[PDB]
PDB file of C-alpha atoms in Angstrom:
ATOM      1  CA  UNK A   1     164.533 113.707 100.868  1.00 54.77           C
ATOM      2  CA  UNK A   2     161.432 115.661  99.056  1.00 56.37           C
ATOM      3  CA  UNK A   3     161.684 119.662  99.158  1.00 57.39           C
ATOM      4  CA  UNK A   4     160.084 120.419  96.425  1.00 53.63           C
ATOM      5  CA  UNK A   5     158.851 124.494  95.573  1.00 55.47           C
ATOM      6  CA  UNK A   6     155.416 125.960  94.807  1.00 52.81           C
ATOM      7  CA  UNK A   7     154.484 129.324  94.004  1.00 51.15           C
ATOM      8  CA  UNK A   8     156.855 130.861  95.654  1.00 51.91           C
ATOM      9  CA  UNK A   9     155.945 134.801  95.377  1.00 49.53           C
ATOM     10  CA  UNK A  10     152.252 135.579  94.107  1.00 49.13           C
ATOM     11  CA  UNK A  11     151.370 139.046  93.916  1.00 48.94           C
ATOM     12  CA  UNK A  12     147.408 140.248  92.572  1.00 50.81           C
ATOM     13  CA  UNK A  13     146.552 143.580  91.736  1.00 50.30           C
ATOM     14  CA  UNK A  14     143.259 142.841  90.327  1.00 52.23           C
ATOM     15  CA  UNK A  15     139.231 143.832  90.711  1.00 52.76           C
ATOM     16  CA  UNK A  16     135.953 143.312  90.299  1.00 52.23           C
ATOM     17  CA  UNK A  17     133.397 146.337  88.939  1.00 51.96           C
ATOM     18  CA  UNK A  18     129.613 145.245  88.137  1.00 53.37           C
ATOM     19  CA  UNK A  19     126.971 147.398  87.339  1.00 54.13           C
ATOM     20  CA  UNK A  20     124.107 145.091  87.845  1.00 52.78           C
ATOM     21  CA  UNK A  21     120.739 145.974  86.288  1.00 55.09           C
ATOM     22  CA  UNK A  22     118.718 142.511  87.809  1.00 57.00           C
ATOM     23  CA  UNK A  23     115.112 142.407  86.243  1.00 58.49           C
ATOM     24  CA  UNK A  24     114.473 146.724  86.294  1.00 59.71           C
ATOM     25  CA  UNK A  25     111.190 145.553  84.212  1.00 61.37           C
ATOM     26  CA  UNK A  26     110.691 142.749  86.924  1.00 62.54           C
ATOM     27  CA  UNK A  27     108.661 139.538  86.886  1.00 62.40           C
ATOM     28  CA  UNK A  28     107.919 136.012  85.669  1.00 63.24           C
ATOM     29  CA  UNK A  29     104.695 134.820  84.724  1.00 61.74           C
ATOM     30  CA  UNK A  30     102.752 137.940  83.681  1.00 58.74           C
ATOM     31  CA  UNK A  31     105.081 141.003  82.590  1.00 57.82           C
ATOM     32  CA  UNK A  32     103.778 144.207  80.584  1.00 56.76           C
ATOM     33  CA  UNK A  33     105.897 147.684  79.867  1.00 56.81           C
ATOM     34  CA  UNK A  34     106.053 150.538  76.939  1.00 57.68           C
ATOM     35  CA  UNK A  35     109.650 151.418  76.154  1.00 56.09           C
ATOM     36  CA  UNK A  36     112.656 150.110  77.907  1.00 54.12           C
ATOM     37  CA  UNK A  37     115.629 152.493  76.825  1.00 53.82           C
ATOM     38  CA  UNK A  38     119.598 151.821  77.375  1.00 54.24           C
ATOM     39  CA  UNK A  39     121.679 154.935  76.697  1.00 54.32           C
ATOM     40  CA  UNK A  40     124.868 153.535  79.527  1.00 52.64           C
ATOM     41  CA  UNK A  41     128.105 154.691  78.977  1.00 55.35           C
ATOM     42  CA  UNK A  42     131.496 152.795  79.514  1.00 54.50           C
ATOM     43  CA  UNK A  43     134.760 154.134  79.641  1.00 56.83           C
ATOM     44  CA  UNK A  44     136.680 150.819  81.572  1.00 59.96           C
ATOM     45  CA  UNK A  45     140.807 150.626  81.356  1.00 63.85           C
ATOM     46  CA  UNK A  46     142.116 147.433  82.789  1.00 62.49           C
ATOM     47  CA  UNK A  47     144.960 145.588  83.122  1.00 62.26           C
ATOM     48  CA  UNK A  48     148.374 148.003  83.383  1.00 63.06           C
ATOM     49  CA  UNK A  49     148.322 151.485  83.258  1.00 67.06           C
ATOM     50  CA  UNK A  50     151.364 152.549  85.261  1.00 67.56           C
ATOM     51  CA  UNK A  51     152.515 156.554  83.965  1.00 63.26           C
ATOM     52  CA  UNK A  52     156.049 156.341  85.193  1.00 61.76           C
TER      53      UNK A  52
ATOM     54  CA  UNK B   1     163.097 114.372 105.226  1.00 61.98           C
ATOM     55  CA  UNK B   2     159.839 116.109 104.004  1.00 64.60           C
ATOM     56  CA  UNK B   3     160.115 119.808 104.148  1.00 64.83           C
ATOM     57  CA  UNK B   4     158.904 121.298 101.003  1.00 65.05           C
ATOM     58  CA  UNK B   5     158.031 125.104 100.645  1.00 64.56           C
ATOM     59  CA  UNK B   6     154.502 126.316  99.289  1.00 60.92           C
ATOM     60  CA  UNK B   7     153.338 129.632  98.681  1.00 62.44           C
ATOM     61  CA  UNK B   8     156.121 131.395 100.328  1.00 60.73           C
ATOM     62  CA  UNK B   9     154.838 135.143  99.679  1.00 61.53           C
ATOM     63  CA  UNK B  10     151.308 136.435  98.504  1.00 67.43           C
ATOM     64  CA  UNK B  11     150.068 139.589  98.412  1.00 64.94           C
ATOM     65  CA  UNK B  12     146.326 140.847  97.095  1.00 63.60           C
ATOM     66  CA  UNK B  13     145.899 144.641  96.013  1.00 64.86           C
ATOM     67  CA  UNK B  14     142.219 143.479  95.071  1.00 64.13           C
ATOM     68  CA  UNK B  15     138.921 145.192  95.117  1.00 65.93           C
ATOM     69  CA  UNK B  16     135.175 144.693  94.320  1.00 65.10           C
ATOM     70  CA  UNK B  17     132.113 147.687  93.531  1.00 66.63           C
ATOM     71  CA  UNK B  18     129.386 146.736  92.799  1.00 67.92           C
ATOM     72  CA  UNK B  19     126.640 149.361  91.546  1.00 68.32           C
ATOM     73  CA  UNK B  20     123.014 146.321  91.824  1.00 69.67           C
ATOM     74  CA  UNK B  21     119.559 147.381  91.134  1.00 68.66           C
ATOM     75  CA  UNK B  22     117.843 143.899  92.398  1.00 68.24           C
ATOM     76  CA  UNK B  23     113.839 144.168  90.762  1.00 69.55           C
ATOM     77  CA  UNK B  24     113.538 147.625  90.988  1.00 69.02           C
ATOM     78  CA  UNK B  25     110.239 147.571  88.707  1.00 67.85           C
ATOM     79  CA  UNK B  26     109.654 144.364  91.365  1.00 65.69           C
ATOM     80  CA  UNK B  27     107.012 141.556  91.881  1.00 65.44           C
ATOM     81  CA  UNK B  28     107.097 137.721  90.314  1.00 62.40           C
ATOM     82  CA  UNK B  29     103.187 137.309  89.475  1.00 63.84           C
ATOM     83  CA  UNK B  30     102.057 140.154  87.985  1.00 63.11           C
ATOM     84  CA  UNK B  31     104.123 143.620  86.944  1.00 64.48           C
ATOM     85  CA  UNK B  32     103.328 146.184  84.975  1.00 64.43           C
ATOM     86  CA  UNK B  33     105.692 149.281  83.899  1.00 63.73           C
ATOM     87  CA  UNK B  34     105.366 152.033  81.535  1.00 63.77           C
ATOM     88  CA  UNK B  35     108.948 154.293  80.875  1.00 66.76           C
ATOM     89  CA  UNK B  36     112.501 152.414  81.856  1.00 65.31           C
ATOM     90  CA  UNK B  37     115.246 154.568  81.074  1.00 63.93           C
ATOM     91  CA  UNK B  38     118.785 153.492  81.586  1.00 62.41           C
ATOM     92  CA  UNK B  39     121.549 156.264  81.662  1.00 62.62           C
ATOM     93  CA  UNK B  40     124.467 155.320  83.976  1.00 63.08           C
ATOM     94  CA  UNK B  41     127.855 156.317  83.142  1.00 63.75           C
ATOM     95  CA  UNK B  42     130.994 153.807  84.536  1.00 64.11           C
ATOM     96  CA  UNK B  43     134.702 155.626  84.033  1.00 64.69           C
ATOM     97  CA  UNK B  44     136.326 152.619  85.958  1.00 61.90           C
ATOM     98  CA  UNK B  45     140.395 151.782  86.360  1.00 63.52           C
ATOM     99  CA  UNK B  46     141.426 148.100  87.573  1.00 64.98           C
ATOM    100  CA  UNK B  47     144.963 146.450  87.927  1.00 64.65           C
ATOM    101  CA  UNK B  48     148.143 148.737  87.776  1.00 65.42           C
ATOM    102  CA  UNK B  49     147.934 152.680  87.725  1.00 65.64           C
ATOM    103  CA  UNK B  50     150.892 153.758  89.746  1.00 63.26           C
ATOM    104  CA  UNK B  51     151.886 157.292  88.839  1.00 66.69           C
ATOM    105  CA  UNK B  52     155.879 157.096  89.965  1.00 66.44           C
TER     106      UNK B  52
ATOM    107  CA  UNK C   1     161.150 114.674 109.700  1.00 66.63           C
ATOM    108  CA  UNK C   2     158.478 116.488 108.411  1.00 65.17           C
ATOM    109  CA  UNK C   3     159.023 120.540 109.276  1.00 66.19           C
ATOM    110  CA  UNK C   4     157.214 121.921 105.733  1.00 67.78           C
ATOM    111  CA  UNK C   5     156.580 125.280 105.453  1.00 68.48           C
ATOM    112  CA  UNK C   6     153.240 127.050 103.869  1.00 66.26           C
ATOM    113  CA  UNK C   7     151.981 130.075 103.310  1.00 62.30           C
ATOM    114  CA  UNK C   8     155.028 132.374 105.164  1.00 61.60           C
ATOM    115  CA  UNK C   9     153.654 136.032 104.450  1.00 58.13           C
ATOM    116  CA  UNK C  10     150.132 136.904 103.565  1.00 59.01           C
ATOM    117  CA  UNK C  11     149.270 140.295 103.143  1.00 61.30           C
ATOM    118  CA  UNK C  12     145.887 141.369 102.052  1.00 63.61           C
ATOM    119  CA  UNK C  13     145.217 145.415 101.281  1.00 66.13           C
ATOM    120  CA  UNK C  14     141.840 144.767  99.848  1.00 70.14           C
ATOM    121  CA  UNK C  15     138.259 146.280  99.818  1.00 71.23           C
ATOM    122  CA  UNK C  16     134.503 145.793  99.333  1.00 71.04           C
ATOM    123  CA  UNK C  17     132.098 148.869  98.156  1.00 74.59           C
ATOM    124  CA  UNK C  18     128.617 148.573  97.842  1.00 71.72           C
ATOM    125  CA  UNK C  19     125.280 150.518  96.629  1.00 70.18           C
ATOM    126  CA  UNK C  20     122.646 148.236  96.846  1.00 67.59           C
ATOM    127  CA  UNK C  21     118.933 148.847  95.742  1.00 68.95           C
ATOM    128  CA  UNK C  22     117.459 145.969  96.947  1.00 69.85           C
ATOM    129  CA  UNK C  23     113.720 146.240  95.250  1.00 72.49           C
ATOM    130  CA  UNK C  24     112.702 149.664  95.166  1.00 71.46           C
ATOM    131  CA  UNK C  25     109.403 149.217  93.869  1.00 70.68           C
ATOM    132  CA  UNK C  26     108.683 146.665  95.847  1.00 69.30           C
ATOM    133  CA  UNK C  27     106.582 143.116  95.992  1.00 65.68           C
ATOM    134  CA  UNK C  28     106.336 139.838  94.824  1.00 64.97           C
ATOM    135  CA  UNK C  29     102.310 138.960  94.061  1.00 66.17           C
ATOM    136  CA  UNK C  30     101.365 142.554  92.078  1.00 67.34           C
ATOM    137  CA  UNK C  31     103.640 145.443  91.254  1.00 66.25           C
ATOM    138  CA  UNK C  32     102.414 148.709  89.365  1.00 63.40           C
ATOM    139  CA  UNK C  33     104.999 151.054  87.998  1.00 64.44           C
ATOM    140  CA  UNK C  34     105.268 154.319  85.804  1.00 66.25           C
ATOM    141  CA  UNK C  35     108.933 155.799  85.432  1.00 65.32           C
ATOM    142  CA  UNK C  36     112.005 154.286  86.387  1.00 63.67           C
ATOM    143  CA  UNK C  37     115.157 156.564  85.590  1.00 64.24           C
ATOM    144  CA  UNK C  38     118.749 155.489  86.511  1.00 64.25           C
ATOM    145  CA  UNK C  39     121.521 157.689  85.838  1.00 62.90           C
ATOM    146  CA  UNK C  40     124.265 156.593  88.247  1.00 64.36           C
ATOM    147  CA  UNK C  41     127.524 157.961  88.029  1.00 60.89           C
ATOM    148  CA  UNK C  42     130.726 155.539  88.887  1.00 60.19           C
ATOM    149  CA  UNK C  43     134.474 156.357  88.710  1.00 59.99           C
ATOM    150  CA  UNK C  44     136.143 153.756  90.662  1.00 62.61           C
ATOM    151  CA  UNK C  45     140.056 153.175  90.465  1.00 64.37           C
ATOM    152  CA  UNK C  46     140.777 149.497  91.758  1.00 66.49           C
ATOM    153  CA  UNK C  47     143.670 147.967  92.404  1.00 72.20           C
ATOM    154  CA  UNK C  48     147.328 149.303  92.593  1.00 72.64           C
ATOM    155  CA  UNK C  49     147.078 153.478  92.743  1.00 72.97           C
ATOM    156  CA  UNK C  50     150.227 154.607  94.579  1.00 73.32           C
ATOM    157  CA  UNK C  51     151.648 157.989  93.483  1.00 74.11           C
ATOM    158  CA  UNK C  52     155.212 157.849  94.970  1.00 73.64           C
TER     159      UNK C  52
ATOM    160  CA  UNK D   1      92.583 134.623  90.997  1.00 74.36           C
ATOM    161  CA  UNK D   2      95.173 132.552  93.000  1.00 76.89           C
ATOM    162  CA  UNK D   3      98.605 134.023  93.175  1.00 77.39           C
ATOM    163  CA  UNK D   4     100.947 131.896  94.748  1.00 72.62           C
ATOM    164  CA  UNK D   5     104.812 132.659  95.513  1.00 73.03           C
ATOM    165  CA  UNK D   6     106.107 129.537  97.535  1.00 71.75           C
ATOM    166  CA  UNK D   7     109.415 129.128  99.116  1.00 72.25           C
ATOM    167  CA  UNK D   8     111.079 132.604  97.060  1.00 72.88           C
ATOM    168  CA  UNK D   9     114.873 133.851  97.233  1.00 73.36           C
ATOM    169  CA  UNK D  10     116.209 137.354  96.700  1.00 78.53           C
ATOM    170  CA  UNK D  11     119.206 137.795  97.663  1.00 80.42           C
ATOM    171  CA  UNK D  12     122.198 141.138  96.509  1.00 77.77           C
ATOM    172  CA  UNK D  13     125.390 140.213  97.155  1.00 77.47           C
ATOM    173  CA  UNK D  14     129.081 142.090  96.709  1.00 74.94           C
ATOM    174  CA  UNK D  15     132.183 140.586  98.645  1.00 75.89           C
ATOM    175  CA  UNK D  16     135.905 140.718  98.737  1.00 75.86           C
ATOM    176  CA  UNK D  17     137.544 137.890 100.183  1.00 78.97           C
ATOM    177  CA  UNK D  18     141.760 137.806 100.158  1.00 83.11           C
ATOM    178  CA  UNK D  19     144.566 136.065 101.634  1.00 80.69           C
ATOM    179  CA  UNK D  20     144.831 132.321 102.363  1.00 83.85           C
ATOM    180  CA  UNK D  21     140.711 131.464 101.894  1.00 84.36           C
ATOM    181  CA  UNK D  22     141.344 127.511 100.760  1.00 83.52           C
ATOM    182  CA  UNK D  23     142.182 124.482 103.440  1.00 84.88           C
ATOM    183  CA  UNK D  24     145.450 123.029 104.849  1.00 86.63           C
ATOM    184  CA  UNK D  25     145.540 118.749 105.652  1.00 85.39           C
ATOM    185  CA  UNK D  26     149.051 117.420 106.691  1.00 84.89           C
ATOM    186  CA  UNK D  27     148.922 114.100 107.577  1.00 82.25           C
ATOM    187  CA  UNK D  28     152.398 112.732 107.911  1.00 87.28           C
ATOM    188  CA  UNK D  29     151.133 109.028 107.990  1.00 87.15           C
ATOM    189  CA  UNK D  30     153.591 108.090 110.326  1.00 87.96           C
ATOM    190  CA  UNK D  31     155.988 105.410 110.975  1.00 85.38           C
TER     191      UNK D  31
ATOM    192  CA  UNK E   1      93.189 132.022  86.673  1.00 84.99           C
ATOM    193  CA  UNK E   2      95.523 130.155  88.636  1.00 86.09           C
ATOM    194  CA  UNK E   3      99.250 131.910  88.460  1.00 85.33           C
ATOM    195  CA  UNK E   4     102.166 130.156  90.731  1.00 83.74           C
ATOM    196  CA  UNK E   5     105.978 130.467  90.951  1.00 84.89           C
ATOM    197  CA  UNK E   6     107.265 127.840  93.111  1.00 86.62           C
ATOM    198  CA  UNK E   7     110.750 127.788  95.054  1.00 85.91           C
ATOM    199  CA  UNK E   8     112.142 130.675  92.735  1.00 87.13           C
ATOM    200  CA  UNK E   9     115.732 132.045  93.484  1.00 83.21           C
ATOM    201  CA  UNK E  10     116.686 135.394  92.040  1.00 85.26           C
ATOM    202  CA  UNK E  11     121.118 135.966  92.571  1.00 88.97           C
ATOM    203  CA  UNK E  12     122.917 139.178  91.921  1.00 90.12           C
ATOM    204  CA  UNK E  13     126.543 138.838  92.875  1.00 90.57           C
ATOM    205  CA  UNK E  14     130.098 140.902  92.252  1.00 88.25           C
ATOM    206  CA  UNK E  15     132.902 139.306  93.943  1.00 91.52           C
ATOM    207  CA  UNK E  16     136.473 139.496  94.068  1.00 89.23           C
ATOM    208  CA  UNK E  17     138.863 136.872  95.444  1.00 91.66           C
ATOM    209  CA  UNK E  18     142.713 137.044  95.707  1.00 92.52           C
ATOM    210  CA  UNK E  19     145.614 135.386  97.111  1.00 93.31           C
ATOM    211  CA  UNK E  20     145.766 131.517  97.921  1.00 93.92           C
ATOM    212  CA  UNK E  21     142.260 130.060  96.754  1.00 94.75           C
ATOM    213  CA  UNK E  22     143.208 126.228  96.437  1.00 96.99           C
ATOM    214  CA  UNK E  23     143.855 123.390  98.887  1.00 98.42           C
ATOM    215  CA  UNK E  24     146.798 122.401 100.412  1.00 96.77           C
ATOM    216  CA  UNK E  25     147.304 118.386 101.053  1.00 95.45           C
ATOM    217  CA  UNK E  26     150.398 116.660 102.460  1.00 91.69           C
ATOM    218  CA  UNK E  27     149.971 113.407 103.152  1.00 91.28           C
ATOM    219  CA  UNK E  28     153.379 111.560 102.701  1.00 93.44           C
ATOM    220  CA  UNK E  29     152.883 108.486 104.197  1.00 95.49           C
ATOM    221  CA  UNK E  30     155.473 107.182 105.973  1.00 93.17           C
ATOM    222  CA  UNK E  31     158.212 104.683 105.710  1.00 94.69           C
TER     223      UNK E  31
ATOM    224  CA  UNK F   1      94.571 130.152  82.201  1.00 93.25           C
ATOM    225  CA  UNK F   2      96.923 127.943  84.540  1.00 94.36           C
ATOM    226  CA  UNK F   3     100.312 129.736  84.761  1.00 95.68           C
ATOM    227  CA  UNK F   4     103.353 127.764  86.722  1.00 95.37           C
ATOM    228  CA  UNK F   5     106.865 128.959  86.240  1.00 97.56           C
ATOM    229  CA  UNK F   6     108.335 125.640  88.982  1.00 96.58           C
ATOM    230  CA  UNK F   7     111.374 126.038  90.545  1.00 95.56           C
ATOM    231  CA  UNK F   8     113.543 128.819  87.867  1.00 93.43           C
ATOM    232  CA  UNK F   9     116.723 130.189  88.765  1.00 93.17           C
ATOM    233  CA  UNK F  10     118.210 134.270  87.623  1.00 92.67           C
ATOM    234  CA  UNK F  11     121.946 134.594  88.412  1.00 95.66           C
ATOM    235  CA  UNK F  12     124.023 137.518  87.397  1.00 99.12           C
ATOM    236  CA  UNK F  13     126.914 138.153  88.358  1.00 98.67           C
ATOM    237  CA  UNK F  14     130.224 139.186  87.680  1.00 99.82           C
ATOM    238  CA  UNK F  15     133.707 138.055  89.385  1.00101.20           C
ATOM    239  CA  UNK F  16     137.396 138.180  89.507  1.00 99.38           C
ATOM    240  CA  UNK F  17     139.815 135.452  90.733  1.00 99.08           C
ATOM    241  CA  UNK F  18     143.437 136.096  90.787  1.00103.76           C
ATOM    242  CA  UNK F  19     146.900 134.188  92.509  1.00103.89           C
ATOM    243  CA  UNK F  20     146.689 130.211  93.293  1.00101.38           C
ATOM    244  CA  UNK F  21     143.437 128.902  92.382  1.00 99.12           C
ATOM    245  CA  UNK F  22     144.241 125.406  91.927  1.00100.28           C
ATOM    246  CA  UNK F  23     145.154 122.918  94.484  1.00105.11           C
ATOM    247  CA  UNK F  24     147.921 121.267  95.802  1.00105.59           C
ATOM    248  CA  UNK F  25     148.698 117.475  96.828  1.00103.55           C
ATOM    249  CA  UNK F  26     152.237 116.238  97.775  1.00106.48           C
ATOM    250  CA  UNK F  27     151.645 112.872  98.380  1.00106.64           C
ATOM    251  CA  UNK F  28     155.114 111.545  98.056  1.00107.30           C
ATOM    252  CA  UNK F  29     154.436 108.202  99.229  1.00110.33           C
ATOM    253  CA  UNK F  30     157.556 106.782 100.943  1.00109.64           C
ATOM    254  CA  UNK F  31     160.466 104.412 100.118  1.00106.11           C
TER     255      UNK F  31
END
């Protein structure tokens, strides 16, 4: 006799959000620019957040 | 008498966004840029916000 | 006898959003650029958002 | 000049994959 | 001048994965 | 000048993984 349990009830609520920003200013072996400027604004909430 | 039990109930709430700018100032030999001006804004929620 | 069991209820309420700019300006052997501007705006819930 | 790119990859990806995504072997063995 | 990139491989991902990711292996054996 | 930039690689990315991401062997093995 075996019957051992595993994981029994799994339940994700979960994501993924990426702002990707992959070489803007491009390049590799000869690269020239003026002013790069970041100004971004976050405002992430994550996990549980439930008002009830 | 084998019969074990694995894994008996998942369930996935799950997303993905993805905002990607892939070389948008390009090229791999030779680029050349003058202004880059980054201003995005991200208000993102993940996980758990049921009202109820 | 063998009879396991595996995997009994798999429910998936998932999603996938993309904006892709795959290189805008362009090229791989000479790029010229003057302004790039980015001012995206994102405001993604993910996950669990039932009202009930 | 010589301005060579040989063999490049560019590649943008997003994905969402959910549910059962790995593999399943049984294989008793017998008597 | 003489400028080269060889085999070059540029990657933007986002990915999300959920539910059962791993593998599943048996195998009792037998007697 | 004699530039070479040979065989680079540029990942970014960003991920989630969530429920059973490890895997399972039974593998009891008989009497």
């Amino acid at each position: 006799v075996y019957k051992p349990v595993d994981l029994s009830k799994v339940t994700s609520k979960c994501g993924s959000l990426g702002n990707i920003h992959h070489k803007p200013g491009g390049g590799q072996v000869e690269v020239k620019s003026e002013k790069l400027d970041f100004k971004d604004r976050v405002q992430s909430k994550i996990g549980s957040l439930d008002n009830i």
